[PDB]
Amino acid sequence: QVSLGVVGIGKIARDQHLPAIDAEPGFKLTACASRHAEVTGVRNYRDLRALLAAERELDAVSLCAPPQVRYAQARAALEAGKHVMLEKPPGATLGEVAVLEALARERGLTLFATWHSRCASAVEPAREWLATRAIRAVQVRWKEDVRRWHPGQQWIWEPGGLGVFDPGINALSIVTRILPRELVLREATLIVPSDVQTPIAAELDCADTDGVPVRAEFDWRHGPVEQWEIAVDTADGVLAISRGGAQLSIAGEPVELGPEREYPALYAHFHALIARGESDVDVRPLRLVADAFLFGRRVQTDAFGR
Amino acid sequence: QVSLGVVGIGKIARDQHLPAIDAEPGFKLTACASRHAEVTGVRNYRDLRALLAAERELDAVSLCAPPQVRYAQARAALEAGKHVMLEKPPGATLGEVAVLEALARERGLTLFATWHSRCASAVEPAREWLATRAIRAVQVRWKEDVRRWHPGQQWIWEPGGLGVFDPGINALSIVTRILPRELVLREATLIVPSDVQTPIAAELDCADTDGVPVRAEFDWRHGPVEQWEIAVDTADGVLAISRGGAQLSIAGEPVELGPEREYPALYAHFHALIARGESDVDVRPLRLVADAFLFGRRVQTDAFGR
């Protein structure tokens, strides 16, 4: 049993992390760090530094806080000799993560940048279907009401919070896993409300290296349709991922899929990486987003307001 | 003796590229591509695709055009079997540069992402002196009036053109060569005029992996003093680079250096890279600018004039 600590007991820690952990006998939940929350049945600390000082035999740490505080938490846990699992996005910058990964490597420690939507049930069968085939186009639609799905949340609007790319990077994490060739950004448009620091919507125009166009529209504004779809057009028909990876159809037939166990799968993968002395740090979805922030044209819109 | 083609005969090609090539026996200037200019004594083409179709025995290509068109040109040159030298920034995005690097390896071709300010005479002496001293803090000041130094240039203000980071990235390419440890961006502020798509001023708060603060101020606005300095505080005194890397002082005492031969040295390195069969693609200065566009707070400022 690998001794596990968890940092930042908020929405996703209680909804997904704690249940999955308790159902991984491969980890044993030992301690938690959170400023304004406590988890019963374990030792609890206010911050990770006080956890690391007191939990000398702790093996591993999993970061469930916002991405603007991940680098300092990941760095401290690796200093103290712990394996590290990162919620997504793996950091607020690319430079952060490169340093974390060199640091983990240097100490033989496991660093896991997680992309939970990559563990959706449609991803692996769609990747197998798409390996050989000739692809013609990809389109992504990722639209939801931020007020309905992130009520009152602030850090999403602060520097390093990604804005609409916080769920949008999920779709990019699927796209980059299911297509075989790499993506280049050709053009992007970011749409930023004048009272926040991150985009509320974006359109992305990419191409993979054989020139296959990949288009994506991200939108958090009130709208008629909430959708989480990726549609790959091929000589052999259309592969259509919907419901955020939980549903798949190939050429117009449903594919039977095992039920959704994203976070169970991630923790099983984190436990296997520790067992093999390995790391899994794929930052390509973040790199694409960075390219959008670096290369995209930016447009001002009406205030998000209250 | 390498057969060479130059694309984009504008200001830097006239000012530095062509006279460096002419004084480098390693290269024979064979052909130029430019839509609105012609070079004497060589075959000239309106664009690179035409040049590649008639220049069969050509070996290598140097790209001197704006960054937004660098990818399509470099990929074509690499796909036609030519070594490629990139002006800086090596691209408008990180993803496009990773694609070029991978493509040149697959073909065995040399790809050289150049940074002319890394060849300034102060850089290597400064790198040598700093390699194992105790560094306390680093300060960077890169300030000049764009109306004086870049008059009538417009691609600097378009997406992918970097704005004040076009000269700013030069400083970043020196800091990143002379400091032994990697940089993490902790905070950035970008000052963007309402009528352009790139910033005219920026502040970066960085730290190296030992915790050394690295601060940089970039400014293209009207101000008191032009300056292009990198000052490094150590327990053994201050190392100060000034005049864009042409001047170096150590503990108040100047150090005397080779005359400025930045592009002669860039082209000597390119030839040597082709001799060895290697590439040189250091995108760290660009990755850091991308972290600032991603993570930085943005402030709209008054219209620049255009």
Ligand SMILES: NC(=O)c1ccc[n+]([C@@H]2O[C@H](COP(=O)([O-])OP(=O)(O)OC[C@H]3O[C@@H](n4cnc5c(N)ncnc54)[C@H](OP(=O)(O)O)[C@@H]3O)[C@@H](O)[C@H]2O)c1
């Ligand atoms: N549907 C989802 O929500 C979802 C799904 C998948 C992945 N994620 C990812 O998981 C992360 C956050 O989603 P969320 O549920 O965790 O939002 P969250 O509830 O706002 O953040 C989780 C907790 O981190 C702590 N926190 C906030 N600021 C902190 C700071 N400066 N220092 C230390 N701790 C701080 C807070 O707990 P304390 O106040 O007690 O310290 C917060 O309760 C994000 O990276 C997100 O993209 C979310």
Ligand SMILES: NC(=O)c1ccc[n+]([C@@H]2O[C@H](COP(=O)([O-])OP(=O)(O)OC[C@H]3O[C@@H](n4cnc5c(N)ncnc54)[C@H](OP(=O)(O)O)[C@@H]3O)[C@@H](O)[C@H]2O)c1
């Ligand atoms: N000037 C400096 O201070 C300086 C110094 C060192 C390095 N650099 C770097 O060198 C690169 C070029 O800089 P520059 O100062 O020479 O800019 P520039 O004066 O605009 O010259 C670039 C030339 O590329 C061609 N061009 C412009 N748009 C093009 C397009 N869509 N497609 C094809 N060709 C196009 C143009 O030649 P045609 O119109 O004839 O086709 C232009 O004359 C930049 O990446 C810059 O960062 C600049």
